[PDB]
Amino acid sequence: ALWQFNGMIKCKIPSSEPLLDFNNYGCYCGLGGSGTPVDDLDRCCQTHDNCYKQAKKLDSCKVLVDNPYTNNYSYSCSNNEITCSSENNACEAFICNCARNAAICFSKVPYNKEHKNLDKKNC
Numbered sequence: 001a002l003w004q005f006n007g008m009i010k011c012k013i014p015s016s017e018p019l020l021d022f023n024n025y026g027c028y029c030g031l032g033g034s035g036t037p038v039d040d041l042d043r044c045c046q047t048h049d050n051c052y053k054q055a056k057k058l059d060s061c062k063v064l065v066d067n068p069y070t071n072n073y074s075y076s077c078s079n080n081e082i083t084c085s086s087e088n089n090a091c092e093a094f095i096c097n098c099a100r101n102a103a104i105c106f107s108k109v110p111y112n113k114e115h116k117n118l119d120k121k122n123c
Ligand SMILES: [Ca+2]
Pocket: 027, 028, 029, 030, 031, 032, 033, 045, 049
């Protein structure tokens, strides 16, 4: 959910405050997302946006009726490695994977400050 995602990013990027650094970045990092991603990090966010959107259409999440920020799945972080919990059911596990993928993606791409707080005209 939101706090787990934030903790997962920190796990991979220990010097960051993801709620400050990765919010409002490019066209997809933060509320909504549309247009063409401005860079690779923006693509990470785009992918993660699509993943949560896919989660919602899942039979398992739908047999229940969650919210990608109301789902208390479990994960751990050891040595900057994120492990989604075996205990997570199919829905929780799919969402946790979306987040773990996003976090690793964030840790693998350049950060371009010029793209921080981008006017959505460019999207
Ligand atoms: Ca977004």
